[PDB]
Structure formats: structure tokens, C-alpha cells
DNA sequence: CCCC
């Protein structure tokens, strides 16, 4: 009864067509989940799958009208939706899915279970995924040159390893890492190595991501971040030199939220998935227009203190404190990298680092202590704290400090506040941040006389 | 079974229809690969190929319904995508492909391997593609007149025919070229000669691709530059008079990238390859909004200094600085050029120039010296270097130079910088340049005081 | 902006004959701009709109073209008839 | 798509 309905039933039982929340159908032809908005591929799937059906069913699929009828039945059979790209522990290649937690490579129906849509763009070879090869030794030497293995560099090396390993996992990342370094220090070597390692999943973005309005009008620089697993910002137009817009804290906050606000061109949709690790390259100390408790909770830094400079200007990179170590430049490294010689060696190193840091939950951690910009706001947390349980039954001692009691609230004259705050830190070295805080957190008991609803830790610590 | 499926299988086995990565169906009719979105050619290919199928199959291809059925089968059979236009040293013609590195002309299945989907639009003629001819002498005379072979015109002529010969290369170029010069000098004659020589691979586009947003809405002014080996946006809107929008350096940077963003109407293909040698006709020096070292490496300029005028205006041309040679105008030259008389002669000229410049790699080189706008940044780059690792055991002597030591980082105050750098540039003519430099380079120690993290080369060289 | 490129593509042809009703004859004749004053034709617009002069003007244009048909047809600028170009 |  209705042979074509039975053909549709079998093609449905093979689980080769799925319906997504976008309304599109993702089909499995040629060992990959494909979909196309302007041209469905269900009839291509029917023609390709005609081989697995019984002998009497294969002849009915050589007519375009019958394949269109089968496609109509299949479309009317799909009601429930599914989810795509939900396994962050899997790396999708062009001919399979690699498992980071195990190391084995799956192909065909073994890669079919994970509904992976994006891909790295190149095939996977088992021969090059080995730990004994002169590409491996050369890459290890290069990485040791980039990051010294000294006891002083232990924390920096560890966090560099963690950050580079976290470019494989396909989930949201809660921090933005600063690859602080200088010219000819090897951050470009890391960029090229990572691009060669993860293929099409690596995208490089300019300054517009950092200090420009993300929403504004049209902005393709954000929509490209959809499902990419690494985002790189380079050639930063220094904010230390005046004339450039400061880093927008709201931009960093939006880029850390699991959903990214941003729209493509000629697109009716606004939401695009965010799995990207965002690493910022800089030769220069960063700055922020506004700084809030939520901000320095999403910032970590890596410092590169090794040079590869030509012998002509060696003392030019040797005779000051800013940059510490100087090695010899290598010229053929860029050509060898572009020839993708160490791609699989770097892939093996990345998987090894992930396995070393695959503790049950993967999570990046911020280290705001290494940014002098926050060094004024991470110390004022040790200086100023807000109102808490009970200062009321101790007003006898704070009165002599200059504090005044107003409607059962302890306030402070501005001059007395400055006098109490000037003791721990210099009024000139930190003076700009000082009067910035003064004008930022001043409360008006009136227009003329200003008061503050804060008491120092000093006044709390000192009886 | 299903005769029409067998016909589709045979037409697929002949390897005449391919699916491109952009989604276009390219067909092989009349010894060339053609694709057209609005008038698909698969049915034309079926009708033309009907002569190679057996006698029993050729009679079914005279009905449009059966041809549409065969086209449906073919469309369902093409799953994988191929790579096109990957050979950068092949000049495609209407009846074959000419090898530039050898000079041999291919046709048929020999030219089928190179999937060149663009063509000059005219057929190749070996008899006219010869070294000796009266047309050859005439054309050589005109080219000698436009650019003389004098020793004062050696480098300029060399850049002229290097840029002209690069128009045959099907690969992305790194620089933009402005033909600067006065009217009645040969820019239009050179443009029309090149147009006649290289056929449809030549495109004249608008001023939009320079000063307007490239994304915008549908932009046919960029979607037509797909795989075009030369692009001529002439008639620069001279910016000397206020009211002309300056060319955005962002657009210059984007044009060099091997892809551009642009969509045609009623279509969804947004990626266009960039094989173009951007040549901009002008009579005045171009001016950009922002000038930096990134733009410094992407500008090339060629000049024309030979006049062609009627006998009445001969004396004025003889009495001008702008012109180094005066010749009587040829009245029918434009007509004979439009008649495509010098087509193959100029083709041979360009091919010989390409062979003469045929190093295994063909890279274009920029000319920074010949731009008045670029004079300021060039001299500055030879005077200062950034704060480097050269300056701990030199703080003893730079203190007398005005520099101060802040956290072992050498900085210069604004007044000292002014009184040390004013000796190389004057205040009046370079007033805006100096003001922009000092405000885009200034760094603040606090709100009031400011300094510079820059040291001149002379101070570093000085002990 | 005026340059040598703009000076090679501009030509000017001047008109000085005035047509007016008899009421405004003297006022027109008291002006240097006009060298000749003639009487207006009222049905001229209608007979022109009726395509009456079609083939006559076609023959006139063909005769003028044949008179000026040297093997190449080229238009020549007249830079001397513009005050802005004088400098 | 133009059009705002």
C-alpha cells in the first residue's frame, strides 16, 4: 500500500534527515551533515540512498516526480526538532569527529551520532598524529624558545598552556585573555601555529571588536564569530597614546555573555552561537573607559618576555628592563608554517594540553593582579568597603576621625576623606586615579557640602 | 530502465557540468566554461551534446520536457564541489587557454583541465600574434611616444609596463596604481588599448568601491569584479576643492584581501574573488582620511608626460613644465583603436613583458616616495623609534637631552620634544602635520602633565 | 575646478535673435542682448507638435551632415567663448 | 529591491 510512503518510512528510519529549530533540514550525504537554505538536499539524499533500499524500491527513485513525492512525505513526517553542535568535547574534521577526552578518531556512522555542522576544513591523518617525528622536536624547541621553562615562568607557561588548549572546546568561555608582548616576540608564531592547527575554526578580527559599538548598524565582524572556536585581535592602535577610543567595558561584557548581540548583512536573524576563545594581542598597556566589579572578573593576561631580533639592533632589545630575554630570529619558520609542516604536531600538543587540563569542568580563570590599570581598583577593595551589619554601636570612635553622623548614617567631609586616604598612597603617582575616584563616587548631601557613605578599612582596622 | 536517467548518467560521465563552491553550475559549451544564473545552460548543454549519445538516445532530447527531466536528474547527481580558477598564469580566451610561462595555446580537452570561468570574449589568432608586422611597428611607435625610453624615464617606464603586464596574472595583487598626469597625455589611449587587448577580463567600475561602504545593500558595482584581472575606476573626484570625500584606508586594506563582499540583485552569492589590478585614472594627488604605515605599503603611482595636440596649441605645450614632449594629435587613432586593430599586437607586447618579468613569483612593489601626502610620515619614520629595551645604561646622558626615567622607562616631555624636533620641520607649512603627530602621540602621566614614550634615533646614536 | 582637461571639452553657440509680440517690441529693441526683433507666431507650436516639419528638418540635417561628412566626424571645443576660461 |  502506497510504495512511496514505505520508501519515505525507510529513509526516515535511517535517521539521515533531521529538522532544526531554524526550520531547516540537515541531511547526511557524503559523510557530513549539510544544509542549504536556497536549495534543499532531500532529493539528493533520496537518490544517494536508493542503494540501501530493497531491490523493488530502487527503481522508483529514478524519477524526479517520485523523488519529489517522497520528499513531501518525509517533510510531513518530521515534527519534532533537534539540536546541532551540542558536544563541546568533540572536534569536527572534514571526514570525521575527533574526541578530545579519549584521543580516538571516528568516521562515518561513528561520527554521525554527534550532529556537528562546522568543520576545520581539512582531513585527518593518523600517521602524523604521533609524538615521535622531527616536526614534533622542532615544534617543541620552538615552543620552548617562545616560553622559557624557568621557575620564574612557571605560572606564565601554565596559563599560556591552558589558554592555548582551551581553543579546542566548543563552549562559551568566561574570560578574555591578553597575550601581552612586543614585536618580534613570537605571538605571531603562535597565531600562525594555531591557525594551521584548527583550520577554518580560527578567525582573526580587528580593533572594531574591542573599542567599537557591536550593535550599531551593520557589523559583519560579529556574525563571523558564529561557532568559531578562536578569535584573535592583533595590531592594536595603542590607547596609551591619546586619540584612540578606550576599551568599551560593555563590549567585553557582551562578548563574555553566552549570547552575543550582533547581526549579519542581508540576514533576518540576530542570534548566533558563541564558542570562541578570545585572545587579545597588545604591545601596550590597556585602558578602560569604565571599570566595574564585573569587569576585572573577566580579564587574564599572558606576558611574553623573549625576543627574536636581528643582531644589528641587539643592544636595542638588550639594554632596558621592558623586555627581558633576547634570542636569534629564524627566517624559514614562516615558510615552514605556511607549508603546514607542524600542523598535526601542534594538534597533538593541543590535545595533550587539553587532556592535562580536562578536569571534570573546563573553565578559564581571571588574574587581574597583573594589570596596573586595575592596580588602583583592586587595591581600593582593600581600602574602601560598603555598609555592613553594625557600625551604629561604635560611633564614639569614628567621630574623632572626622566622620559625622547624619540620620544614623556615618558620613565624611571631602577634605577629611582626602586626608585619611592620602596616607597609604602617593598623591602624584596615583593622583589621576585618585581624583577620578573622587568625582566618580561622590554623594551629594547637598550641592556645596559633599559627604560619603563609606568607611575605610584603615578606620575599621585602627580602633 | 529509465532511459532519461541513463542519458543523465552519460552526460555526467562526459564531465561537462560542475558545481562550484559558490553554488553555480558551470557548463562546457563551445570550448569554454560558462555559467549564468538567470538563464541556466544545462538544457543548452543537453541539446548540444545530443550528438555524442547513441542513436536511440538522441531522439529524446528534442523535447523540452525530457530535457528538463534530464536536467533534474543531473542536478540531483551533483553533490561535491570542485575548485575553479586555481591557475594564475593562464590567460583564457573564447576558444582556448594561453600559457603565459611558455607561450603555447591549448584548445579542447587540453584547455578543459583549467577551469577558467572567465574569458577575454574574443577568439585567439596565432597569425596576428607575431613579433613582426606593420601593426607591430605602429603600436611600438605609439607606446614609445606615450612613455619615452629616455634615461630620465627608465624607472617610470619599468613600473609602467610591470603594472601593465601584471594584468594578465590571475591572482590577488598587493598594491593599487594611480596614473597621474595631465590631459591629452595617453591615459585614455592606454586604457582603451588594454581594454581591446584583454577583452572581458577588463572592467570599468564606479567611485563607490573606494569611498563608500562595501557591504551596504546589494552592490552590483562590486559583485561584477568576480574573477576580473583588471579594474579601472577612472575620473577621480579631485579633492583639492572642498566637497570630495576622501578615500577610506579601510577600503584600501579590504581591496587587497583575496576576497570582497558584494551581492547581486535576486541572488545569494556574497563572496567574489579578487584577481584585479586596481588602476585609478586621475589628474590630482589622492588624499586619504587617515595615514599610517599600514597604508604605506599598498600605493603605487605611474606618470605620463607626453602631449598630443593640434598645431594651433603647439607653442603652449612647448612652453610648459608639465610636458616633456609634444607631438601632433592623430585624429583617427581613437577610431582605429575602437576597431580593435591593435588587439593582438598589444597582447604580444604584454605577453613579452610578462615573460621578461617572469621570475617564478610575480609580486607587485609599492612606491612610497612619489606621494606629497606621504612625505611627512616617511621622514618621521627615519627619525624616531618606539620605547624599546635599549635605554637602561643610557639614562645618565639622555637626562641632559630632557628625557626622564619613569619606572626605568625613558620618556620625553612635550616641551623638550617640541624644542628638539622643531629643527627639522617648520611650524607653518607642516602645522597640521606636526599638531596631529603631537596629539596622536602624546601620553599623559596624569591629567595635567604629559610626556612621550618616543626617542629620536639621533639621541640613541649619540653616546 | 577649471583645468586643461575641462578646457578641451566645452563648446558654446550663442543666440541673439528675439521673437516678441508687438506690445513688447520697443522694450526688446532697447536692449543690447538682442540684435534683431521679429513677430511671434502663435500656431507655430501647434504645427510643430503636429510633426509637420519632420521630414523637412530631417532632409536639412542630412544635407548638413553630408556637407560636413569628412571621413571622420569630430567635435571641436571653443574655449574662447567662456569668461571663466579666459584667465 | 527600493527607500529612507
* Rg over C-alpha atoms of chain A, rounded to the nearest angstrom: 29 Å
Helical run tally of chain A: 18
Give the oligomeric state of the chains in this entry, treating copies of one chain as homo and distinct chains as hetero: part of a larger assembly
Helix fraction of chain A?
Answer: 25-40%
Strand content of chain A: 5-15%
Span from first to last CA of chain A? 93 Å
Number of strands of chain A: 19
Strand order of the largest sheet of chain A: 8-9-12-7-13
- Shape call of chain A: globular
* Sheet with the most strands, sense and barrel status of chain A: 5 strands, parallel
* Structural classification of chain A: alpha/beta
Q: Greatest contact pair? A: A-B, 40 and 43 residues
Protein model, in words:
This is part of a larger assembly, with three copies of chain A. Helices cover 32% and strands 14% of the residues of chain A. Chain A is built from 18 helices and 19 strands. The longest helix of chain A is centred in the N-terminal third of the chain and has 14 residues, at 64-77. Chain A starts with a helix and ends with a helix. The structure holds one DNA strand of 4 nucleotides.
Tell me the layout of helices and strands.
This is part of a larger assembly, with 3 copies of chain A.
Chain A: H1 3-13, E1 17-19, E2 25-28, E3 33-34, H2 42-49, H3 55-58, H4 64-77, E4 90-92, E5 97-99, E6 105-106, H5 109-112, H6 134-146, H7 154-165, E7 176-180, H8 187-198, E8 202-205, H9 208-211, H10 220-223, E9 230-233, H11 249-256, E10 260-261, E11 271-272, E12 277-282, E13 299-303, E14 306-309, E15 325-328, H12 333-338, H13 343-356, H14 377-380, E16 384-385, H15 395-399, E17 404-406, E18 409-411, H16 414-421, H17 431-440, E19 455-456, H18 457-461
Chain B binds one DNA strand of 4 nucleotides through loops.
PDB class: dna binding protein/dna
Keywords: Monkey pox, helicase, DNA replication, Complex, viral protein, DNA BINDING PROTEIN-DNA complex
Entry title: MPOX E5 hexamer ssDNA bound apo conformation
Amino acid at each position: 500500500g502506497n510504495k512511496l510512503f514505505n520508501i519515505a518510512q525507510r529513509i526516515l528510519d535511517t535517521n539521515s534527515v533531521l529538522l532544526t529549530e531554524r526550520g531547516d533540514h540537515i541531511v547526511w550525504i557524503n559523510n557530513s551533515w549539510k544544509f542549504n537554505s536556497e536549495e534543499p538536499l532531500i532529493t539528493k539524499l533520496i537518490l544517494s540512498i536508493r542503494h540501501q533500499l530493497p531491490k523493488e524500491y530502487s527503481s522508483e527513485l529514478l524519477c524526479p516526480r517520485k523523488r519529489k513525492t517522497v520528499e513531501a512525505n518525509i517533510r510531513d513526517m518530521l515534527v519534532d526538532s533537534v539540536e546541532t553542535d551540542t558536544y563541546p568535547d568533540k572536534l569536527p574534521f572534514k571526514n570525521g569527529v575527533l574526541d578530545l577526552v579519549d584521543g580516538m578518531f571516528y568516521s562515518g556512522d561513528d561520527a554521525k551520532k554527534y550532529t556537528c555542522t562546522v568543520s576545520t576544513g581539512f582531513k585527518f591523518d593518523d600517521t602524523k598524529f604521533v609524538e615521535d617525528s622531527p616536526e614534533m622536536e622542532e615544534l617543541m624547541n620552538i615552543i620552548n624558545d617562545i616560553q622559557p621553562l624557568t621557575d620564574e615562568n612557571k605560572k606564565n607557561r601554565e596559563l599560556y598552556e591552558k589558554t592555548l588548549s582551551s581553543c579546542l572546546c566548543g563552549a562559551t568561555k568566561g574570560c578574555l585573555t591578553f597575550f601581552f608582548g612586543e614585536t618580534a616576540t613570537g605571538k605571531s608564531t603562535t597565531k600562525r601555529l594555531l591557525k594551521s592547527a584548527i583550520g577554518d575554526l580560527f578567525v582573526e578580527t580587528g580593533q572594531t571588536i574591542l573599542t567599537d559599538v557591536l550593535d550599531k548598524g551593520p557589523n559583519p565582524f560579529i556574525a563571523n564569530m558564529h561557532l568559531k572556536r578562536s578569535v584573535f585581535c592583533s595590531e592594536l592602535p595603542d590607547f596609551a597614546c591619546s586619540g584612540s577610543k578606550k576599551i568599551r567595558s560593555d563590549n567585553i561584557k557582551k562578548l563574555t555573555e553566552p549570547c552575543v548581540i550582533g547581526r549579519p548583512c542581508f540576514s533576518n536573524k540576530i542570534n548566533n552561537r558563541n564558542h570562541a576563545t578570545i585572545i587579545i594581542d597588545t604591545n601596550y598597556k590597556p585602558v578602560f573607559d569604565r571599570i566595574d566589579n564585573a569587569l576585572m572578573r573577566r580579564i587574564a593576561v599572558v606576558r611574553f618576555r623573549t625576543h627574536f631580533s636581528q643582531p644589528s639592533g641587539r643592544e636595542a632589545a638588550e639594554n632596558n628592563d621592558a623586555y627581558d630575554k633576547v634570542k636569534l630570529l629564524d627566517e624559514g619558520l614562516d615558510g615552514k608554517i605556511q607549508n603546514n609542516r607542524y600542523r598535526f604536531a601542534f594538534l597533538y600538543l593541543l590535545v595533550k594540553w587539553y587532556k592535562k587540563y580536562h578536569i571534570p569542568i573546563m573553565k578559564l580563570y581571571p588574574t587581574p593582579e597583573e594589570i596596573p590599570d586595575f592596580a588602583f581598583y583592586l587595591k581600593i577593595g582593600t581600602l574602601l568597603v560598603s555598609s555592613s551589619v553594625k557600625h551604629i554601636p561604635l560611633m564614639t570612635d569614628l567621630s574623632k576621625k572626622g566622620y559625622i553622623l547624619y540620620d544614623n548614617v556615618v558620613t565624611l567631609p571631602l577634605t577629611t576623606f582626602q586626608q585619611k586616604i592620602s596616607k597609604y598612597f602617593n598623591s602624584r603617582l596615583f593622583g589621576h586615579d585618585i581624583e577620578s575616584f573622587i568625582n566618580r563616587h561622590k554623594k551629594f548631601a547637598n550641592v556645596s557640602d559633599e559627604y560619603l557613605q563609606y568607611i575605610f578599612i584603615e578606620d575599621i582596622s585602627s580602633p
